[PDB]
């Protein structure tokens, strides 16, 4: 079995944005995906064991929150498997290996519809214009898009934002990265509440919840992507004495008077019995006091919901007469 990219004839390719109300812009924080569609012909000379490749843009990944996933098998309309694929994270490349199917059928053609998301490690900044390129065999297609990230929600001195940055479907946990006071306001008597009681979904907050807090230095700038790839870069100021569970599937973290941004990384579990991943939602609320004499306060909230997309591979060959 050897490379047969030269024996693959790509007849159609397209890169499509997951949503239709923001053309030219990928709202990564709204979970907007990039869909790569490609149709190709497989030369009859191709035999079992031969391989072909498919590439996603180097600024993208198949899955944003996970590193483990299955590449779609290419099956024909009878269910027969034409090829199976594997993914290489180092070069964002998929390799498909043809089965005995190619030695039985002829005039084989196939179509792939592959989902992908912006790779936050490659695109830390908001408004990053990219000329994304996807490839199949020796053919390619390009599309210019701008990556847009979210902004903090603020109310007086209370200001924050958050994003889910991982999901472990085996252990049923999600990771949420929270930016507290990204605007560097003078937030008095700051309290941060993390709640698993959402209006569209939920998570479980209890004594198993893992919370870590980091301080952002005067010389540092949090990435707009809302995802930290190297926490050793930030000062760990975690102190469990300031985190206390609440009476409503929640937890309260006392920050006191602050003027700098902080990062909270939380690992919480979600109900294993859920049948809809989009019902995994975690809410965060930052409270600050705006009047030291009356205690009058203000709150700013943010919430995240898990999102997902799927990929597929279809094909068909003719049984020779």
């Amino acid at each position: 079995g050897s490379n047969v990219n030269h024996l693959i004839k790509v007849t159609d390719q397209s890169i499509t944005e997951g949503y239709d109300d923001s053309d030219g812009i990928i709202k990564a924080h709204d979970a907007e995906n990039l869909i790569y569609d490609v149709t190709f012909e497989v030369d009859d000379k191709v035999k079992s064991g031969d391989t072909m490749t498919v590439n996603i843009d180097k600024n993208t990944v198949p899955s944003d929150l996970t590193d483990s996933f299955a590449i779609p098998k290419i099956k024909d309309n009878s269910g027969e498997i034409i090829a199976t694929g594997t993914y290489d994270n180092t070069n964002k490349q998929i390799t498909y290996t043809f089965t005995d199917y190619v030695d039985k059928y002829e005039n084989i053609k196939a179509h792939l519809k592959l989902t992908s998301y912006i790779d936050k490690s490659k695109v830390p900044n908001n408004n990053t214009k990219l000329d994304v390129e996807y490839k199949t065999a020796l053919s390619s297609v390009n599309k210019t898009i701008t990556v847009e990230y979210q902004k903090p929600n603020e109310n007086r001195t209370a200001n924050l934002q958050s994003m889910f940055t991982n999901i472990d479907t085996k252990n049923h946990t999600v990771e949420q990265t929270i930016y507290i006071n990204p605007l560097r306001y003078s937030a008095k008597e700051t309290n941060v509440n993390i709640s698993g009681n959402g209006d569209e979904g939920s998570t479980i907050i209890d004594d198993s919840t893992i919370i870590k807090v980091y301080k952002v230095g005067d010389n540092q700038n949090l990435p707009d992507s809302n995802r930290i790839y190297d926490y050793s870069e930030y000062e760990d100021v975690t102190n469990d004495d300031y985190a206390q569970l609440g009476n409503n599937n929640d937890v309260n973290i006392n920050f006191g008077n602050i003027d700098s941004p902080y990062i909270i990384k939380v690992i919480s579990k979600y109900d294993p019995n859920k049948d809809d991943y989009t019902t995994i939602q975690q809410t965060v609320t930052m409270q600050t006091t705006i009047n030291e004499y009356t205690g009058e306060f203000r709150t700013a909230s943010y919430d995240n919901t898990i999102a997902f997309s799927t990929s597929s591979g279809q094909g068909q060959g003719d049984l020779p007469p």
């Binding site: 996933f69 809302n226 799927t310």
Partner: peptide, 11 residues
């Protein structure tokens, strides 16, 4: 066979 990401919302 699921590929994950996440959404953000501001109340």
């Amino acid at each position: 066979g699921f590929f994950f990401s996440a959404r953000g919302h501001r109340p």
